[PDB]
Fold:
Amino acid sequence: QRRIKSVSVSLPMLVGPYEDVCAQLTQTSSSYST
Amino acid sequence: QGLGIASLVMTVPHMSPTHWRCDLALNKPWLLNVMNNNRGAETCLFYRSSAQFWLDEKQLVEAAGQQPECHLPFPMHLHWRSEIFDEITGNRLTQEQEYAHGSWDGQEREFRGFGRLIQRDTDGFAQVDIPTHP
Structure:
């Protein structure tokens, strides 16, 4: 069996010194009825 | 610069752009660059970085899709071109050289030459009566 414990993300990018990139992620649905 | 003499390089991590440089050094100093005698012999002498030559080599290597093993971990800086100008007649002599596969001792940590050397030359003419055939 497998269940998700946690997640994180990483972006190969360049960013301005004090640029706060703004984006968001969301889950639509998941298998196994969690 | 690959020039064999450095430039100032800086970041100012305040704005989004940050980097700046100053090319303080235009040429490597302490190279005997003109020879003359007051009789009328005089020369212009020219000199170039091994890293620059290797960049040319690497450009061709990847144009061939070949693999870079020109193992020479140091930008030595070396003779490239010279002109000898006759002060009297105003004619002159052009001679130039190139070289490839700069070479190094990975155990003794020492120079091992070049795989290939090349020379070219023509006069320059006060004269179209002389077509050069270089």
DSSP finds one helix and six strands in chain B.
